[PDB]
Curated annotation (Swiss-Prot), chains A, B:
It is found in: Cell membrane; Cell junction, Gap junction; Endoplasmic reticulum. It is linked to Oculodentodigital dysplasia: A disease characterized by a typical facial appearance and variable involvement of the eyes, dentition, and fingers. Characteristic facial features include a narrow, pinched nose with hypoplastic alae nasi, prominent columella and thin anteverted nares together with a narrow nasal bridge, and prominent epicanthic folds giving the impression of hypertelorism. The teeth are usually small and carious. Typical eye findings include microphthalmia and microcornea. Oculodentodigital dysplasia, autosomal recessive: A disease characterized by a typical facial appearance and variable involvement of the eyes, dentition, and fingers. Characteristic facial features include a narrow, pinched nose with hypoplastic alae nasi, prominent columella and thin anteverted nares together with a narrow nasal bridge, and prominent epicanthic folds giving the impression of hypertelorism. The teeth are usually small and carious. Typical eye findings include microphthalmia and microcornea. Disulfide bonds join C23-C34. A connexon is composed of a hexamer of connexins. Interacts (via C-terminus) with TJP1. Interacts (via C-terminus) with SRC (via SH3 domain). Interacts (not ubiquitinated) with UBQLN4 (via UBA domain). Interacts with SGSM3 and CNST. Interacts with RIC1/CIP150. Interacts with CSNK1D. Interacts with NOV. Interacts with TMEM65. Interacts with ANK3/ANKG and PKP2. The gene is GJA1. The chain holds residues 165 to 219 of 382 of the full protein. Signal peptide: none annotated. Belongs to the connexin family. Alpha-type (group II) subfamily. Expressed at intercalated disks in the heart (at protein level). Expressed in the fetal cochlea. This is Gap junction alpha-1 protein. Sumoylated with SUMO1, SUMO2 and SUMO3, which may regulate the level of functional Cx43 gap junctions at the plasma membrane. May be desumoylated by SENP1 or SENP2. Acetylated in the developing cortex; leading to delocalization from the cell membrane. Residues 13-43 are extracellular. Gap junction protein that acts as a regulator of bladder capacity. A gap junction consists of a cluster of closely packed pairs of transmembrane channels, the connexons, through which materials of low MW diffuse from one cell to a neighboring cell. May play a critical role in the physiology of hearing by participating in the recycling of potassium to the cochlear endolymph. Negative regulator of bladder functional capacity: acts by enhancing intercellular electrical and chemical transmission, thus sensitizing bladder muscles to cholinergic neural stimuli and causing them to contract.
């Protein structure tokens, strides 16, 4: 279960968060730029959880 | 002068106006959609002026 959850996280998200996300969805015309909330602190906590899971 | 102005109009604009214009300029992120004012009536008057110039 631990390795499966790690693989799913790697597939969907990776292990980092980018401040700017390019979104191409049906309602939005062409491509739009979106901005996440506190990407850096979330990335830090993501790395922390990855290390915890690995241990 | 008449033929030169007609050629310039053909090069820059053509002889029609589209309601939706796709704009890709530096300030705008990616591509944006813009909407002209009364495109159809302007197209009608453009054709009228083209006919007048041709005559």
């Amino acid at each position: 279960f631990e390795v499966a959850f790690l693989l799913i996280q790697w597939y969907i998200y990776g292990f980092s968060l980018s401040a700017v996300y390019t979104c191409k969805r049906d309602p939005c015309p062409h491509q739009v730029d979106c901005f996440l909330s506190r990407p850096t602190e979330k990335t830090i906590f993501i790395i922390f959880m990855l290390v915890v899971s690995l241990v």
